[PDB]
Amino acid sequence: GSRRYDSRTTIFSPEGRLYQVEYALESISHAGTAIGIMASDGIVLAAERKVTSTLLEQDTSTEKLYKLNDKIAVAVAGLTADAEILINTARIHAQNYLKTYNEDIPVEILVRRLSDIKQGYTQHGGLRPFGVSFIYAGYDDRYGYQLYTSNPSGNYTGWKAISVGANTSAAQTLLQMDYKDDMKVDDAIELALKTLSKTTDSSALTYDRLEFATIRKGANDGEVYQKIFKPQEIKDILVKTGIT
């Protein structure tokens, strides 16, 4: 019958690894690099679009950076279509929490929920896992500014600075070298762009190949603002930091 054609997506190898998870991670290593850096006064998200065209409408385009709510955003590395399925689920979870408790969802609770959904596809159902790694940038009044990552296995961890996608080994070494705890957002903006500039597979880093976002308490008094940078604004910050 049908058993003949079943790939068995949820089995261990003899070494105790999950085949499909490992192969999904291999897929993600070819995606455009995304970086997150956490500072005392905010968080930076920077990400590289994959080999673009001059005829691509950039100002209406979104493939890397997504808003989950007013306090939490994500950077994507992997299959964009897979990511949008999970993103919509996360947006709904955040609203469910807000309706139930009348408070914004704490960052970790949202991260744990999405990660549990990823885990399920590795243990039951016989379906392929989601080929996506997320960087979560968010703020709540318990832990303040927070950075997380999750991968197809459904495992998640917290970070001061982190990269996903292509050239993470090189990127992480550069971040580990220049990152300091008392760093500020404007310094973190520069570090993120400098790291992408060195790790990129492209010839030069220009505005049309980047997506950028900051989460600042640089919002008038005790509140948080998300800023998804416009193409012209990415062009200006590239000149300011002296990359173009």
Partner: protein
């Protein structure tokens, strides 16, 4: 629904998916449990391949199931969250219906039952997780320490370790732990637990976590400096 039998017998009478789940446990960071006369200590290894980590928010290795019981693990981190959530729900359900918190043995028996179920249910794979469950029964001062594994078997231990290089630290515990006289104080128990991890860990810096559980819901996690003082005193006695 997806019904495929993933866990099945082989000609030699082995269930390979369950045995391969144990290989995932072997890969996980080391976890150790030691019970004294009036306490239980859970020690955990943190691999230092990951720095630039935010230790405030990163998932901790020891989890409270209730105010009087804790659970640590070795193996797949994502898998362990599912067992921890189920155990927490069952702990509250037990309080709701029996009007008494779970015994450590009952909670162990439940988690072990969940693990067994995932070895002969269609369309699912076994958990790649072994657990150490420790605590004190309500209104009881006798220390409790249990172990579970992917197959679903469980048992009580005077001291036990799981995860990578657990063969080495079990060797240490088997010659250093006396049953007639267990670590009489918290100090002695923590010292023996840190000593056992130092056989395997590397640097005694942010690589060792220690959690002490005492009777009547008295649970506390030691800080870096407190553990660092044990690390210092152990090697200064060793230089002799």
């Amino acid at each position: 629904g997806y019904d495929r039998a993933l866990s099945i017998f082989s000609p030699d009478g082995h269930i390979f998916q369950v045995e391969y789940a144990l290989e995932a446990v072997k890969r996980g960071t080391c976890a150790v449990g030691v019970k004294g006369k009036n306490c239980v200590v859970l020690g955990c290894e943190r691999r230092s391949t990951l720095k630039l980590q935010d230790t405030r928010i990163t998932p901790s290795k020891v989890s409270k199931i209730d105010s009087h019981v804790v659970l640590s693990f070795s193996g797949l981190n994502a898998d362990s969250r599912i067992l921890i959530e189920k155990a927490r729900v069952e702990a509250q359900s037990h309080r709701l219906t029996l009007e008494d918190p779970v015994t450590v043995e009952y909670l162990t028996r439940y988690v072990a039952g969940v693990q067994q179920r995932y070895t002969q249910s269609g369309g699912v794979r076994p958990f790649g997780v072994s657990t150490l469950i420790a605590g004190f029964d309500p209104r009881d001062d006798e220390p409790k320490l249990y172990q579970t594994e992917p197959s679903g078997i469980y048992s009580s231990w005077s001291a036990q370790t799981i995860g990578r290089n657990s063969k080495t630290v079990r060797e240490f515990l088997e010659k250093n732990y006396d049953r007639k006289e267990p670590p009489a104080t918290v100090e002695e128990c923590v010292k023996l637990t840190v000593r056992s991890l130092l056989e395997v860990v590397q640097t005694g810096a942010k690589n060792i976590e220690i959690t002490v559980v005492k009777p009547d819901s008295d649970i506390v996690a030691l800080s870096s400096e407190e553990i660092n003082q044990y690390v210092t005193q152990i090697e200064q006695e060793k230089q002799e």
